[PDB]
Amino acid sequence: ALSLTADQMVSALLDAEPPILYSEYDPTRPEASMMGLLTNLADRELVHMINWAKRVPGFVDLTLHDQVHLLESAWLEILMIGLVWRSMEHPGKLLFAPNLLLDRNQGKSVEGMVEIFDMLLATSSRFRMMNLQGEEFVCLKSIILLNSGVYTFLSSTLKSLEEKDHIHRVLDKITDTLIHLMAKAGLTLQQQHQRLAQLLLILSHIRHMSNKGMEHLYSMKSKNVVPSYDLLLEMLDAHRLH
């Protein structure tokens, strides 16, 4: 897993991509329905996200507790970068699903999105201006999975030191993979390091948007909206019986 080539890593990540899901509304029927639609869509995406995470090279080498911690920290960032990616070719709008495309004025009335709708649109625009490639996108999504929770392993066991070292080794292999993609494309070494930094700085903005989103979700005080550690544990703690 730490022995994949860059091309093999990219191939693995592309193979592991989850599907784009639909909103569950009757398209023959005529608000506050937006949060209901989004909550339902995110619930169904989360199941596929768990399957995807298990195929990110290196991720299933971690303990199940550490897998759960990472997913707990990252899942809304991962939903949001997917949203931004799908919206890249739809300026001024967010493609929540192929049947749920909203513009900014419509977003103005979506619960919890008073700040974040415009932040997501700006991110999508930035991706378009950089001409972000699918291979780069899947690298960034893997980086979020591995990085977002790594500085909150409040554990100091020998095993935890081993876990963090591994996570940093996988992150390093993804950095190498991103650089290789840029070299294949013919970028100079200076352009490669500049572009690597541009992409990684966007991750800080995705964290920001996720924190603002999570603030809203907790404010709802709805028992099942933020996935619990124990729920994520049940989905990740698979048997081998299938």
Ligand X SMILES: CC/C(=C(\c1ccc(O)cc1)c1ccc(OCCNC)cc1)c1ccccc1
Residues interacting with ligand X, by CB under 6 A? 38-39, 41-43, 45-46, 76, 79-80, 82-83, 112-113, 116, 213, 216-217, 225, 227
**Token pair of 5 as six digits:** 């080539």
Q: Which does 227 bind (CB under 5 to 8 A by kind): ligand X, a second copy, none?
A: ligand X
Question: Which residue lies nearer to ligand X by CB, 177 or 210?
Answer: 210
**What is the rounded (10 degree) CA torsion for 146, 151, 153, 156?**
120
**What is the rounded (10 degree) CA torsion for 213, 215, 219, 222?**
60
Opening angle at CA 164, ends 158 and 165, nearest 5: 90
Minimum distance of a second copy from residue 129's CB (angstroms)? 9
Tell me if 45 is assigned to a ligand binding site. yes
Residue keyed to tokens 């950089």: 130
Give the separation between CA 17 and CA 51, rounded to whole angstroms.
9
Question: Which residue lies nearer to ligand X by CB, 96 or 179?
Answer: 96
Query: Could you tell me if 134 and 10 are in contact, meaning their C-beta atoms sit under 8 angstroms apart?
Result: no
Tell me if 169 is assigned to a ligand binding site. no
Q: Which does 172 bind (CB under 5 to 8 A by kind): a second copy, ligand X, none?
A: a second copy
Give the separation between CA 23 and CA 189, rounded to whole angstroms.
43
Q: Which does 1 bind (CB under 5 to 8 A by kind): a second copy, ligand X, none?
A: none
Binding residues for a second copy, rule: CB under 8 A, are: 118-119, 122-123, 126, 143, 147-148, 151-154, 168, 171-172, 175-176, 179, 189-190, 192-194, 196-198, 200-208, 211-212, 215
Minimum distance of a second copy from residue 2's CB (angstroms)? 13
Give the separation between CA 172 and CA 64, rounded to whole angstroms.
22
Enumerate the known binding-site residues: 45, 86, 216
